[PDB]
């Protein structure tokens, strides 16, 4: 069987605010790995503007998302076969307060369930169960 993701992308009503807290868009980044060592321990501009030079042969792709504040998506991925971890970057307004990375090691050939959300700060991964 293949390694089968879905993930439910909740962006939140209070999305990346403004300085003035006025919600506004965040852009997302997902990165299929086979390895995550260096994808955790690369700056921001980095991953976002050189990933292919930065990441080498750990990078198997790279996919872009614009979400907008209160918005909801559901996207299904099979994992390529050698790809082991699934890394997310959000541009976030002030990256020194934002979690604005993360990293999830996804089991090989076994079907995984996520709920994503985008809160004003921070990217949280919860999984979700079957059915």
């Known amino acids: ?32 790995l086979k390895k995550d060592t260096a994808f955790g321990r690369a700056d921001y501009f980095a991953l976002t503007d050189n990933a292919q030079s930065t990441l080498g042969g750990d990078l198997v792709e790279q996919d872009e998302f614009l979400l907008r504040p209160g918005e909801e998506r559901r996207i299904e991925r099979t994992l390529d076969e050698q790809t082991r971890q699934l890394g997310f970057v959000a541009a976030y307004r002030d990256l020194d307060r934002a979690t604005w990375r993360q990293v999830l090691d996804v089991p090989g050939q076994r079907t995984s369930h996520l709920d994503i959300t985008l809160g004003a700060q921070a990217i949280g991964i919860v999984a979700r169960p079957a059915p």
Do not use: F
């Not at 439910?8 to 852009?27: D, E, F, V, Y």
């Open 1 to 32: 069987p293949p390694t089968r993701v879905v993930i439910w992308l909740h962006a939140a009503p209070n999305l990346n605010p403004s300085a003035a807290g006025q919600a506004a868009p965040l852009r997302l980044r997902l990165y299929e």
